[PDB]
Amino acid sequence: METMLFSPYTIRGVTLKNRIVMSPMCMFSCDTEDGKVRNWHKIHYPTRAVGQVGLIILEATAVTAQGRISSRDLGIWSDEHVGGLRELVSLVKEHGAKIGIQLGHAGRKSEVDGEIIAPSSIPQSEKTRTPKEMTKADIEETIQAFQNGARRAKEAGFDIIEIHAAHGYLINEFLSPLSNKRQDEYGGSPENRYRFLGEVIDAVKEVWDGPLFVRISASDYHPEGLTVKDYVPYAKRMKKQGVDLIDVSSGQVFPANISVYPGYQVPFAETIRREAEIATGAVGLITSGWQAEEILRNGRADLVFLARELLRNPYWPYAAAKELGTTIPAPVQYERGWRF
């Protein structure tokens, strides 16, 4: 029973057992408000590894306390976070899943109390706070925080790191001309608006030589913002800097009313894959095994990412295999229930 959905995939000596990925999903469940792993996370993430998902990516994890979305986020801004993340790594990997971490900074979308920072002092909307415009010292300090976060992730035992450059947060605010009005070398041209992302990538590669992903918002959905043609030259540069895969999302940069439907972001993933010759991940209302097999076999992406479907059924790989008429290995404790 040949499917491509259940075939392995290798990225520089890390091999995933199938093409299914659990997409990063904030849980707002750090009840002690100090960034640390709690019981909620130690059941939530291993459930999907028992369910035979090949790669589990943690929710947006803040590289400074000021870069959290909410006070109940996970964090990696302290050497004290390494012990709890290491325990989580061990509980997921015992089931044969590999594990990744999404490194985040919320920028002008931070909801935490106190000062918040951004490339330019413009609020996201009339209902949100005006941020402080970063100085050159703030830029150097934030690039160093991403480096320190990557070192701690290596020390905890993660297999993959992803940089969050999407959905209107700090790095996306530097990339889009809707939010970046700067007059120094970090603004004022397509090359200068890339510079913050390029320096974050270079700083992570100084301490991390394993698989590296970047997640992007391929369109701003605005007449004066970016579209996928602007991201084709940016993806070519990321490949030269040693990024292995682009995880292709869209929007949340500007309030916009957009039409949503099955696979509505798949064309962005295939444009980047074919025009820049780099591996890609697809995401957005992917909910069935039949659908996912078509995406992979026609070369539209290399990995399929699922978020809301794995909140409804965390053992979706069993259901997807039945739909495709194939079989997969089961946890030995569940063999009497996993009949094909």
- According to DSSP, residue 311 is labeled H
Q: In whole angstroms, how far apart are CA 23 and each of 7, 9, 54, 99?
A: 19, 17, 11, 11
Give start and end residues of each alpha helix (H) in the chain: 39-50, 82-93, 136-156, 170-175, 190-205, 228-240, 266-276, 289-297, 308-312, 316-324
338 binds, among ligand FMN, a copy of itself, none (CB under 5 to 8 A by kind): a copy of itself
Shortest distance, position 22 Cβ to ligand FMN, whole Å: 9
Shortest distance, position 252 Cβ to a copy of itself, whole Å: 14
Element (DSSP H or E) covering residue 313: none
8 versus 311: smaller Cβ distance to a copy of itself = 311
CA distance 295 to 280: 11
- Single residue of 111, 209, 290, 329 touching a copy of itself by CB under 8 A: 290
Backbone angles phi, psi at 261, to 5 degrees: -165, 165
Select from 92-100, 107-115, 223-231, 282-290 the region that touches ligand FMN (CB under 6 A).
Answer: 282-290
Q: Is 307 in the site for a copy of itself (CB under 8 A)?
A: yes
How many residues form the binding site for ligand FMN (CB under 6 A)?
21
CA distance 264 to 291: 12
Q: Is 96 in the site for a copy of itself (CB under 8 A)?
A: no
Shortest distance, position 204 Cβ to ligand FMN, whole Å: 17
The b-or-e profile of 275-294 (16+ CB within 10 A means b, else e) is ebebbbbbbbbbbebebbbe
- According to DSSP, residue 187 is labeled S
Q: Which residues, numbered 48-87, are part of the site for a copy of itself (CB under 8 A)?
A: 50
Shortest distance, position 274 Cβ to a copy of itself, whole Å: 12
Type of residue at 62: A
Shortest distance, position 18 Cβ to a copy of itself, whole Å: 16
Q: Is 113 in the site for a copy of itself (CB under 8 A)?
A: no
Q: Is 110 in the site for ligand FMN (CB under 6 A)?
A: no
Q: Is 286 in the site for ligand FMN (CB under 6 A)?
A: yes
Strands 245-249 and 279-282: parallel
Q: Is 92 in the site for ligand FMN (CB under 6 A)?
A: no
Q: Is 184 in the site for a copy of itself (CB under 8 A)?
A: no
Its sign, for the CA torsion 283, 147, 11, 240, is positive
Q: Is 32 in the site for a copy of itself (CB under 8 A)?
A: no
139 versus 292: smaller Cβ distance to a copy of itself = 292
Q: Is 285 in the site for ligand FMN (CB under 6 A)?
A: yes
DSSP annotation string for 76-97? -SSGGGHHHHHHHHHHHHTTT-
Q: Which residues bind a copy of itself (CB under 8 A)?
A: 2-4, 27-29, 39-40, 42-44, 46-47, 50, 91, 94, 259, 261-264, 266-267, 287-288, 290-291, 293-294, 297-298, 307-315, 318-319, 333-334, 336-338
